[PDB]
């Protein structure tokens, strides 16, 4: 098999690799399998849960946990399993040993990370994507990286680097969002990095409906544009 | 026996609902019993323990934890049992667990959780009560409810949910705190969130002072304005 | 043997603290022997590890955790156990418990804990230093003490205190650090940490060039005078 992950928060700016995974899942109609629920991994005042509560009554209760489904392109016969949620906050070593136990008994040969970063970029020009692989051969796609060649990482990187240790060639890319408009409907990125997708696994993906909700994303915050204007400096 | 339980931090604001449980304890001179104090559900930068020093040495050393202690107002029948401390940072579902397991050897009918939140509500009028009850039948006391129907909880609710699930009817109440005025010796709310435990309870609590306290807490708010007639805005 | 640790973050403002642990390790050449790694203690958002990705590949990632190194200044005959690392976010308990166990196997004597604090004091007058130790006779260095007599504690203060009830001798400094100058390249306090260091050990710790870049220090604040006031303040 193959796989397509993504974590929240920290790793993920504007939802672009969330929504991302989200759109492959809907695309594909992915089949939920396992889903890791355990509070070993969990801080619960950093990652709340969520109630829903109806007429003095609550009615559901919704944990963070670690969701994992399966997926068959309609052509292919190439698994797709899809990963989503939020970045535990401790244990991440036998989080991601867990992981891999899964990779294991589903025999997946690829895995691809997608995240998101807040970066100094224009809105009105294409988005800059970066990240690491496996090896310099597997650079191909990047002779350069991501915003942090050396500093702070989260589960995305570690989890690669997991994957690479268990000989599992993994790929990381990144997106680079403008800080400016952070609010999480980005549909631009999301188109980016779903092309890494289509470049990594090989098969195509139905972008459906994500050009248009993009240019009219890109019109409206040029929109917004009497005076506000260090773009200059950002275009060139 | 019944319980009085609330929950220091995010869910309570004003420290509402913790001088609410120490006003009970003090009126009716509660007995210690247990303590929780397990490092499993602790964060300790969140949650720092307080040193006591003095004249070059530390003399005190106090651990966040979980106090419960047991209660009888004097007229009556019944056994009042007193929870009060900080929001643990992990092992919510194992901490719900482990008060049930005090809960049952105690055999206690009922559970009321107490909390309080920042919300727009004027200082000059009412404080507005909401929450959520264990039967549509027991929402009696509201039809409608908490600022969050929806989104993310605290330990207040997960523990008021694990009840329930267990078996035992449980309440929680939300008093609203004006966020202007957020400085934690609010006696306002606390006296509302007091009649609602003399609500389900049924026993009377002395107040005390408690109302002198609110006139002159609210009669030097309305001290301090100029150009800041915004209660008038919440006239409404 | 003796101890002389340190740790990160809260209890280290100006990195005074550890460049102290760093300069003795730097000065008498420290063998690293022990390195507590454990993921029981470290909530990796708050302490994230650090990666380190050169041409598109990961060549190094680096865990928060806790250095142990050993010593011998060339003079003497008394080994010095160094310690260095961040402060855990969770179960300190049993982190003290840890470290008391390899004071245990190594045999040591006596322990000090630096550490550092922002406060209301000039950067154009000495270093104030503060603290606490073993008993009241050992307060010889102290008859008064740290910015919290009574309030949170770090690992630093809990330490100490685990220390003083395994019955082990140990001392805890604390320098003031003008909280307008917060870089943390400040030399000035480090001297000052070092000389508590010699008080207590008696051995002589070479200062090298920590002087020159001390004045060199306070000479560049006092250089910057554009806005600077209220230097009286602080000056009395």
């Given at each position: 098999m193959?796989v397509?992950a993504?974590?929240e928060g920290?790793?993920d700016?504007?939802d ?7 759109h ?22 950093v990652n709340r849960?969520?109630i ?11 944990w ?14 190439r698994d797709?399993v899809?990963?989503?949620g ?7 070593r036998?989080?991601?040993?867990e ?8 025999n997946?040969?690829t895995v691809v ?8 970029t224009?809105?009105t020009?294409?988005?800059p ?9 597997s ?11 050396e500093?702070?990482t989260?589960?995305a990187?570690?989890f ?7 000989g ?11 800080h400016?408009?952070?609010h999480?409907?980005?549909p631009k990125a ?6 890494r997708?289509?470049?990594?696994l ?6 459906a ?5 993009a240019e ?13 204007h ?6 060139q």
């Amino acid at each position: 098999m193959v796989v397509v992950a993504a974590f929240e928060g920290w790793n993920d700016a504007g939802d672009a690799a969330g929504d991302a995974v989200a759109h492959l899942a809907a695309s594909w109609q992915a089949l939920p399998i396992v889903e890791i629920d355990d509070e070993a991994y969990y801080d619960y005042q950093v990652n709340r849960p969520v109630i829903r509560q109806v007429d003095g009554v609550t009615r559901e209760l919704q944990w963070p946990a670690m969701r994992i489904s399966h997926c068959r392109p309609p052509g292919s016969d190439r698994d797709v399993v899809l990963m989503c949620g939020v970045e535990p906050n401790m244990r991440w070593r036998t989080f991601c040993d867990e992981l891999l136990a899964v990779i294991d008994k589903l025999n997946v040969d690829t895995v691809v990370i997608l995240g998101a970063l807040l970066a100094d970029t224009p809105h009105t020009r294409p988005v800059p994507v970066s990240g690491a692989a496996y090896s310099a051969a597997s650079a191909r796609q990047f002779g350069l990286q991501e915003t942090r060649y050396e500093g702070p990482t989260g589960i995305a990187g570690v989890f690669q680097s997991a994957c690479v240790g268990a000989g599992i060639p993994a790929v990381t890319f990144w997106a680079a969002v403008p800080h400016y408009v952070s609010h999480p409907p980005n549909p631009k990125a999301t188109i980016a990095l779903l092309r890494r997708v289509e470049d990594v696994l090989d098969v195509e993906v139905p972008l459906a409906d994500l050009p248009a909700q993009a240019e009219a994303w890109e019109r409206e915050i040029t929109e917004t544009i009497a005076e506000d204007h260090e773009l200059a400096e950002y275009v060139q």
